[PDB]
């Protein structure tokens, strides 16, 4: 996409060398941002063949709130498997904060279903949030989140979304990470008998790995194609019922896929 | 400044029409970033006069962690009490959840020493961040944080923050919002021993008062003067320890000062 090789650039022209806590070398800067309008098409990179199915599941997995990798094994999604412990366990990442925000006074928030009708009830609200930032649990977690926080705005009867991602690798996580965010926007803004709006994804660290240059190379002297459109084939009775095959993108016509590696 | 003066003009050409809880107007935005490198220059706004003195003591107040009103009372800075009930408190606002954020174990961190820290120790990580938003706190606190969740960054000797702000008033808050941050980063690039970067604000709901528009239009006629300087007199012996009379602003020119209201 347009602002997405503009982001690999600058991350080329302006990036800093920095290392990772691996002590893996990268290109970085800090703080971006890029918009995009939901109803322009589907924000899935085109300039190279990304899949989203491991994507859906995960998604559907984080809204189901269990940490443990059992259902993504049931589906052979095996991105969690590098961090999860010998029971398929996470500790409370992501899905645990979305659905069950552990509190002092012993009670478990489900902030998905406390935006859903904040934008039913409230849409005027810009109080709208959900984070998986729970700072007494971080250590529990088998790593900090990526995804921090994002926060919901509703105007002229549109759903945006803004992510803060204080972490990006841009070649082999941003792609999959617009698209899960793109996806739950259009899944929420169905369920508030809502338009799309905008996601608006903004960065903290935001980097290409040394390693990814070859790739980062042959990627910028492709042309982005036509976005592609996604089709939700049935409405579901809450956000919380969503299944695998809801899903259908088409008029995907990307660039070959591009392999690229990580250290250990 | 530039980058301020342009944000007003955007909100003015492209905000929509969008009402607060009070049900007051505004033109809104969501989704906005700018870039301050702080070696230019002290970012205070210079197109209307902006005092630091409440700003000063607020920050420090916040460090200080304790979130009854009495030592802003102390100092006669009375911009909290709108909000704080009749001993003076506040609920669980900025500073306890920066000093004293509560976890379900029953212990309360102090993400201030833990940055500072991580800034020292191990200042390639992705994950030096203080955030204000606890989920299972908000009911407590008078109200939900505006300034949410920051980020600290260092490559080449240089710190930057960058900041979420939920929501923003952008004639009568950002100046202030801006100046807070800005004071921040030099205080823990000084502690350490760093050069200052830049302050990356990032905005959610970004909103003009319908009834600032008068004072919109005047601010926009007006150009920018030089940055002025910050002057910290005093290194201290750390972040916990400074005080109002440490800071100056050297070689301030603004424009003539702008009264703007709010509505009940």
């Known amino acids: 996409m347009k602002q997405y090789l503009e982001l ?6 302006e990036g800093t060398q920095k290392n990772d806590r691996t002590g893996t070398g990268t290109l970085s800067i800090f703080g971006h941002q890029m918009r995009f309008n939901l109803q322009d098409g589907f924000p899935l990179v085109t300039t190279k063949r990304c899949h989203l199915r491991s994507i859906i599941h995960e998604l559907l997995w984080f809204l189901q709130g269990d940490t443990n990798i059992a259902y993504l094994h049931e589906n052979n999604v095996t991105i969690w498997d590098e961090w999860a412990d010998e029971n398929g366990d996470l500790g409370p990442v ?53 995804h921090a926080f994002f926060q919901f705005y509703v105007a002229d ?3 945006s979304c803004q992510l803060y991602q204080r972490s990006c690798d841009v070649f082999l996580g941003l792609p999959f990470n617009i698209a899960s965010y793109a996806l739950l926007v259009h899944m929420m803004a169905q369920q508030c008998d809502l338009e799309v709006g905008d996601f608006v994804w903004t960065g903290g660290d935001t980097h290409l790995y040394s390693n990814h240059m070859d790739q980062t190379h042959l990627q ?8 592609p459109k996604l089709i939700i084939k049935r409405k579901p009775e809450s956000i919380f019922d969503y299944r695998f095959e809801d899903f259908e993108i088409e008029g995907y016509d990307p660039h070959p896929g591009i392999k690229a590696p990580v250290a250990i």
């Open 94 to 146: 992501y899905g645990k904060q979305w659905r069950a925000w552990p509190t002092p006074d012993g009670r478990h928030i489900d902030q998905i279903t406390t935006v859903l009708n904040q934008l039913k009830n409230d849409p005027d609200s810009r109080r709208i949030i959900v984070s998986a930032w729970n700072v007494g649990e971080l250590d529990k977690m088998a790593l900090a989140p990526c």
């Open 157 to 159: 009867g549109k759903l």
């Open 8 to 13: 690999m650039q600058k991350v080329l022209d």
């Open 220 to 227: 910028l002297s492709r042309e982005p194609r036509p976005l």
